[PDB]
């Protein structure tokens, strides 16, 4: 199958209220439509998406999309896939003001918690429920940021040095000396998340009082241990859950960037453009060989350009299944950025994932041979 997509419309923000503006995004079911304020009665545009969330209201239930609804639609399925044995990935996208952080982190005070808190809550709830004598679980966490082509750890305390990126020949890219921490209670992961959000690098700008200056990646490694001592073995299934918050495209002149802020914006834009190029290339690549003939034309995707694409090698393509969450600003002034977000979300829809579960081939071959001898025994016994 392909990538999942969940577009969401953001409500007005005071910058778009002091300057007069109008709603432009409409949507019904799977379809989302935009009209060009530039010249109306010219060419309304529409796009198809698996999931779409309206958030202009809140007390009323008229197509309102609570964070819990978004979680139940995406994160529940992804947690189930993780328990099945697939590595799974969520990544947010949009522009400064879209609302990617609102969806990921949400607000600690509010009951409306973001995707990652609710996923952790449900994961620990199922761990508590399904623990038994013959079934046990292990969970460990990690949290990293990409500031300007440098990986920085968050749970690790103040450490002026950076962390090197190395490629294991079999397991692919990874980061060396990431403070990988275990967890046994929801309080521990909650405190770790709070500390990580505290230590993140954040700066203010005209588009958002508290904007993000760095991409953020939250990773959970989850192990199932089946301990029927008579028959089964432990550490059967290992799964990886990744949750990615990307920085919003900076328009420079509209954001009032200057000095260091401008250089941060430039680096963010370079990373985002590289991400767009890979996404388009990978989409074209999977689309072509799938329908054209089957030749496996050797046009390879290039991920070694930025650390963001390099570290997300597996999630974009390989043994991972994933979803894109594109936030949207309804203000008429933000027309071109909204169109770019829509087009790249549509392109991301064309991408194919190939998540597959793997275990020790010796054990798999032993089980297959056991099934074969069982079949032959049933044949001759009959």
């Amino acid at each position: 199958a392909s990538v999942k997509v969940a577009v969401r419309v953001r409500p007005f923000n005071s910058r778009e209220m002091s300057r007069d503006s109008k709603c432009i995004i409409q949507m019904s079911g799977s379809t989302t439509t935009i009209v060009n304020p530039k010249q109306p009665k010219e060419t309304p545009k529409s796009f198809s998406f698996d999931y779409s969330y309206w958030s202009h209201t809140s007390p009323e239930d008229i197509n309102y999309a609570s964070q819990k609804q978004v979680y139940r639609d995406i994160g529940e399925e992804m947690l189930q896939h993780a328990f099945e044995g697939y590595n799974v990935c969520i990544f947010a996208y949009g522009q400064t003001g879209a609302g990617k952080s609102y969806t990921m982190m949400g607000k600690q005070e509010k009951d409306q918690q973001g995707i990652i808190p609710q996923l952790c809550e449900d994961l620990f709830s199922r761990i508590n429920d399904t623990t038994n004598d013959n079934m046990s679980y292990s969970v460990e966490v990690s949290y990293m940021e990409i500031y300007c082509e440098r990986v920085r750890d968050l749970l690790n305390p103040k450490n002026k040095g950076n962390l090197r990126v190395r490629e294991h020949p079999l397991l692919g890219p990874y980061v060396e000396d990431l403070s990988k921490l275990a967890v046994t209670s929801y309080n521990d992961i909650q405190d770790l998340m709070d500390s990580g959000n505290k230590a993140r690098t954040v700066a203010a700008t005209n588009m958002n009082e508290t904007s993000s200056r760095s991409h953020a990646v939250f990773n959970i490694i989850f192990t199932q241990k089946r301990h029927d001592a008579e028959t089964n073995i432990t550490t059967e299934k290992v799964s990886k859950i990744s949750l990615v918050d990307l920085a919003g495209s900076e328009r420079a002149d509209s954001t009032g960037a200057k000095g260091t802020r401008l250089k941060e914006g430039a680096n963010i834009n370079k990373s985002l453009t590289t991400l767009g190029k890979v996404i388009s290339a990978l989409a074209e690549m999977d689309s072509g060989p799938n329908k054209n003939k089957k030749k496996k034309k050797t046009d390879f995707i290039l991920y070694r350009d930025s650390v963001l694409t390099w570290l997300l090698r597996e999630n974009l393509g390989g043994n991972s299944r994933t979803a894109m969450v594109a936030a949207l600003s309804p203000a008429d002034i933000n027309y071109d950025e909204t169109l770019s977000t829509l087009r790249y979300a549509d392109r991301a829809k064309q991408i194919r994932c190939n998540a597959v579960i793997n275990e020790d081939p010796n054990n798999k071959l032993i089980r297959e041979l056991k099934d074969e001898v069982t079949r032959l025994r049933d044949l001759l016994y009959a």
Binding site: S249, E250, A257, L262, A266, N269, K270, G276, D336, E337
Partner: protein, 139 residues
């Protein structure tokens, strides 16, 4: 002075600036002769077409130059619809490089946003279309 063929379009306005020993009788006769010819096409909604100015100071000659000393000189400023053609050529080149995002990271690394490219292109397309309608014959 620009590699475009004026015959493929229509002349919309013309200013002539004369320097030196020139008389209005001669320029009137010249304008009549140019109006007679068929290769020069004027849009229907500009029945006059021409503006004329005359100055007494003849042009000078720089030492070590290449132009000769002359008694009469003319400068024409013509507003035609042939220009578009040149613009069209340039647009083609832009597309051939923007399909692959070549050289874009240099621009992005200095504060530019990617989308700012596309907008400009669309803007250019708008101007060209308004230079193809301003010349359509009236009905």
């Amino acid at each position: 002075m620009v590699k475009c063929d004026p015959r493929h379009g229509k002349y919309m306005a013309c200013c002539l600036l004369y320097r030196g020993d020139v008389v209005p009788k001669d320029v009137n006769a010249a304008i009549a002769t140019i109006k007679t010819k068929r290769s020069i096409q004027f849009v229907d909604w500009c029945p006059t077409g021409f503006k004329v100015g005359i100055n007494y100071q003849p042009p000078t000659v720089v030492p070590g130059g290449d132009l000769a000393k002359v008694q009469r000189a003319v400068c024409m400023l013509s507003n035609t619809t042939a220009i578009a053609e040149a613009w069209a050529r340039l647009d083609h080149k832009f597309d051939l490089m923007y399909a692959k995002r070549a050289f874009v990271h240099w621009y992005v690394g200095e504060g530019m946003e990617e989308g700012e490219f596309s907008e400009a292109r669309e803007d250019m397309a708008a101007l060209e279309k308004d230079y193809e309608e301003v010349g359509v014959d009236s009905v």
